[PDB]
Design a protein around this nucleic acid. Structure first.
Ligand SMILES: [Mg+2]
Ligand SMILES: [Mg+2]
Ligand SMILES: [Mg+2]
Ligand SMILES: [Mg+2]
Ligand SMILES: [Mg+2]
Ligand SMILES: [Mg+2]
Ligand SMILES: [Mg+2]
Ligand SMILES: [Mg+2]
Ligand SMILES: [Mg+2]
Ligand SMILES: [Mg+2]
Ligand SMILES: [Mg+2]
Ligand SMILES: [Mg+2]
Ligand SMILES: [Mg+2]
Ligand SMILES: [Mg+2]
Ligand SMILES: [Mg+2]
Ligand SMILES: [Mg+2]
Ligand SMILES: [Mg+2]
Ligand SMILES: [Mg+2]
Ligand SMILES: [Mg+2]
Ligand SMILES: [Mg+2]
Ligand SMILES: [Mg+2]
Ligand SMILES: [Mg+2]
Ligand SMILES: [Mg+2]
Ligand SMILES: [Mg+2]
Ligand SMILES: [Mg+2]
Ligand SMILES: [Mg+2]
Ligand SMILES: [Mg+2]
Ligand SMILES: [Mg+2]
Ligand SMILES: [Mg+2]
Ligand SMILES: [Mg+2]
Ligand SMILES: [Mg+2]
Ligand SMILES: [Mg+2]
Ligand SMILES: [Mg+2]
Ligand SMILES: [Mg+2]
Ligand SMILES: [Mg+2]
Ligand SMILES: [Mg+2]
Ligand SMILES: [Mg+2]
Ligand SMILES: [Mg+2]
Ligand SMILES: [Mg+2]
Ligand SMILES: [Mg+2]
Lengths: 54, 119, 44, 117, 109
RNA sequence: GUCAAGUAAUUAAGUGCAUGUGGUGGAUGCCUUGGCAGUCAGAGGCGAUGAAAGACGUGAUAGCCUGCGAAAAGCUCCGG
RNA sequence: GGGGAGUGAAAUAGAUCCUGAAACCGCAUGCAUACAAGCAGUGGGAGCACCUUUGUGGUGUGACUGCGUACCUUUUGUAUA
RNA sequence: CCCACUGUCGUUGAAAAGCCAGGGGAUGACUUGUGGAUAGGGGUGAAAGGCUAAUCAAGCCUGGUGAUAGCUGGUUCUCCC
RNA sequence: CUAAAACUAUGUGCCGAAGCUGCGGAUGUAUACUUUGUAUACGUGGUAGGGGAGCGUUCUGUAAGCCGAUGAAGGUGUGUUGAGAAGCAUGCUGGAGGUAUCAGAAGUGCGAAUGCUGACGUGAGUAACGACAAAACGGGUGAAAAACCCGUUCGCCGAAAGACCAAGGGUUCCAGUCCAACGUUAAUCGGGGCUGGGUGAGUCGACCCCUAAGGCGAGGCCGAAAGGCGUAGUCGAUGGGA
């Protein structure tokens, strides 16, 4: 139910050794030069040479 | 296990789920472009495309079926006068789903659902 | 649950009020003690 | 005369924690643990001042044994023969000679051999 | 020559901001701004505020071009905590800490 | 050159120690506006002419404090 | 919130403001560490790095290795589970 | 409406005694509002030592009071005999 | 491990302790002897406990002295000295005090008391986010919108989850404005902050007249005192009176 000894700072860091984040997959769109998330629409509404909300 | 099972849950009862997809389909047929969560958008295909397939042929029985599945008279009118005639020689694929980042308050992945030859 | 306080202002003033304290020797000793301590409120 | 025990107590704790540099974890940071660690290091060092002499003598004896067995002897008979030949070189010097100068050690083994005969 | 920006008193614990700080340490500022733009982390917003502040400082106060600036140093320290009470079952009470942090960013050529 | 046998260097997800540089925190030092104990000398009461203690008010503009009381941060006279 | 500019003798004296310790939490550098069993040290000891020097020098680290079951209290007696 | 028989759940609870499903009484020796009375070796008790402000084989507060404790615990720098 | 690495007997060597010896150093007692320094000898494991000698801290005198902005105390390193408690010097920080010596007085030394106060860890970025009546989309605003507003749908209650009083609360009511903190998330929203506004009575209620239970009670009776009971009266709504 609870620890019998306080965990040392070294073991705590060794547990967090798997906590790192990853970057996302970003691509530069060619029809706008923009950078967007891959397979995602841009915030301007562009995706693969197609426009939403002109 | 879940082997070969189809369908979603989305944390709702089946009554709530049926109602929510009815609402979503009505909204999409009215605006032709909506923003929703990505799993909702992917399940909305199996709900909204058979309605268009139904609206391809205009019979009183078909319009009554469309009303039983939408319960929205304006949606039925639009299906059988605009959307049905539009997708007459298109063999499926009336919706287009495009991933659209994440919601702010939620970090839930989002998607746009639009009709194919809209606007 | 029903808790013990159950307020009523008339009953408060009739049990712990100024005139109730002034009406007996022990209550006036209460008032003298609370003046000696420098309390800002003498009574309820 | 109220005495505040802040400067002197801090000085003492700092001394104990300076004698604990290099120890692991709390043993170098936390005074209660560092103080025991330091007292124990002291007891260990006292005991090991004695143990070091035994350890180095055993090393010299092993090296002399190797050198004497390269010369057809053993440590026992070589030490006995060198003591019968009035040679009084001690084991530290004998082990140094065996490790660094094989010809002089063969000469010493010859003295021991001739005395054993 | 490093140019510094300090975001002091950001309402987030250091443990969570450090995950984002580790992501962009030693990177170009264009790459770091890209990484921070497309993250769903709350710390990404605050680290982006601090990093774009450092870039603006480098350009205005130090006359450094942005195309070769680099995130040469970044670290998150703890700040002043807020202490609050949380009622628990059976009349027990717990102490809640609302942890803040200080972000330091240094950009260099 | 190839093959075989033998045998080095080379990683750090993270961690330890040391140093450097920070954060947090508010110890220490220095300081005193407040206290403690006395000595000497006084005084030892206030109140129906309404006390102690209060409430409410009172300001060009005031929240609280202090003063004051519908004559209300005050009126008159005398002295400095 | 900060960076400059300015004030000031001083701004890591900038209002959470004299000094600014420890616990505790970062980042940077050097060395070690992913075939190896335990109070984490101690005695020895290679290698590496940096200072210096022509050192049998200093500073950090510490492969490998012998020995080694915390402190207090209470007890006939405690590594004591 | 008053109560609380059974069970599950809850047991750092939504809750320092509940919820939910069932259960009992429900024109009476009923339930309930407002106001009043009884005060600590006392009160009140269709009586369980029950209740008397989440406290009851003698309430709480203050004072005697720094009660007493042949019992636990603790007792702070150095060296020498 | 088997003509032993077993057993019996015998021998020659060797290893082996903080024992003994060597070398160097300190110290107690005693004896000589300068007359307090060296020799000589014997000694120097220790709990309870007894004895002896010291270190350091605050304060008083010495001190109207001595050191200090050419940098005190304090803090943080380094080097060094002593058997120890400790001392000394010095780099950085710091910005105004410090104090020899010899006496004197003690709130004079902390690791433990399930010690006390404050700070900060571990658990751990874990459990949980408070009724399983339910949401969806479009537009607006905004730095930012799952939650705010407008709209279109969906759902839930409907002997309460609606409406009105008493009690209690005390401005939470309404409008403009702001988002740090508070709101178990965000918030542009709010019962949050700031500014302003708002409660209109002969008939409603209270006050008022009247009394119940009960209280207080001139006199009075009783009681060491304090006080207790009570007559006349006077209060007291939960009831009566336009
Ligand atoms: Mg680390
Ligand atoms: Mg399938
Ligand atoms: Mg869910
Ligand atoms: Mg149903
Ligand atoms: Mg790493
Ligand atoms: Mg202080
Ligand atoms: Mg400074
Ligand atoms: Mg400061
Ligand atoms: Mg290895
Ligand atoms: Mg026992
Ligand atoms: Mg026993
Ligand atoms: Mg033992
Ligand atoms: Mg134990
Ligand atoms: Mg154990
Ligand atoms: Mg029930
Ligand atoms: Mg019945
Ligand atoms: Mg009693
Ligand atoms: Mg009686
Ligand atoms: Mg009984
Ligand atoms: Mg009793
Ligand atoms: Mg006591
Ligand atoms: Mg020996
Ligand atoms: Mg001996
Ligand atoms: Mg000697
Ligand atoms: Mg001895
Ligand atoms: Mg002894
Ligand atoms: Mg003391
Ligand atoms: Mg303690
Ligand atoms: Mg989470
Ligand atoms: Mg866990
Ligand atoms: Mg889990
Ligand atoms: Mg969970
Ligand atoms: Mg909720
Ligand atoms: Mg409102
Ligand atoms: Mg918030
Ligand atoms: Mg408000
Ligand atoms: Mg009476
Ligand atoms: Mg009378
Ligand atoms: Mg009356
Ligand atoms: Mg009435």
């Amino acid at each position: 139910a609870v620890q019998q000894n306080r965990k040392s700072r070294s073991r705590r860091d060794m547990r967090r050794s798997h906590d790192a984040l990853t970057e996302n997959a970003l691509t530069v769109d060619q029809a706008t030069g923009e950078t967007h998330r891959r397979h995602h629409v841009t915030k301007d509404g562009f995706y693969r040479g197609r426009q939403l909300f002109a | 296990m879940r082997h070969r099972n189809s369908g979603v849950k989305l944390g709702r009862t089946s009554s709530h789920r049926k109602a929510m997809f009815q609402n979503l389909a009505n909204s999409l047929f009215e605006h032709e472009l909506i923003k929703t969560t990505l799993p909702k958008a992917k399940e909305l295909r199996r709900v909204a495309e058979p309605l268009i397939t139904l609206a391809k042929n205009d019979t009183v029985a078909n319009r009554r079926l469309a009303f039983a599945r939408t319960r929205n008279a304006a949606t039925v009118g639009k299906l059988f006068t605009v959307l049905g005639p539009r997708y007459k020689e298109r063999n499926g694929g009336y919706l287009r789903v495009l991933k659209a980042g994440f919601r702010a308050g939620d970090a839930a992945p989002m998607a746009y659902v639009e009709l194919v030859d809209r606007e | 649950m029903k808790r013990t306080f159950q307020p009523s202002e008339l009953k408060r003033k009739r049990v712990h009020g100024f005139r109730a304290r002034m009406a007996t020797k022990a209550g006036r000793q209460v008032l003298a003690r609370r003046r000696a301590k420098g309390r800002h409120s003498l009574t309820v | 005369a109220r005495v505040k025990r802040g400067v002197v107590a801090h000085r003492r704790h700092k001394k104990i924690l300076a004698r604990a540099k290099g120890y692991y974890g709390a043993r170098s940071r936390v005074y209660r643990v560092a103080f025991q660690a330091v007292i124990k290091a002291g007891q260990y060092a006292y005991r090991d001042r004695r143990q070091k002499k035994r350890q180095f003598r055993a090393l010299w004896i092993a090296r002399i044994n190797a050198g004497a067995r390269q010369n057809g002897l053993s440590y026992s008979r070589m030490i006995d023969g060198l003591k019968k030949a009035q040679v009084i070189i001690d084991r530290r010097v004998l082990a140094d000679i065996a490790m660094h100068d094989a010809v002089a050690f063969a000469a010493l083994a010859e003295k021991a051999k001739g005395a054993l005969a | 020559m490093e140019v510094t920006a300090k975001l002091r008193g950001a309402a987030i614990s250091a443990q969570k901001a450090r995950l984002v700080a580790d992501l962009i340490r030693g990177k170009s500022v264009a790459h770091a701004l890209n990484i921070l733009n497309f993250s769903n982390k709350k710390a990404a917003v605050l680290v982006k505020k601090a990093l774009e502040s450092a870039i603006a400082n480098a350009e205005h106060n130090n006359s450094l071009d942005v195309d070769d600036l680099k995130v040469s140093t970044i670290y998150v320290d703890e700040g002043m905590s807020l202490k609050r009470i949380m009622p628990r079952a059976k009349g027990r009470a717990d102490r809640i800490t609302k942890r803040t942090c200080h972000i330091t960013v240094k950009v260099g050529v």
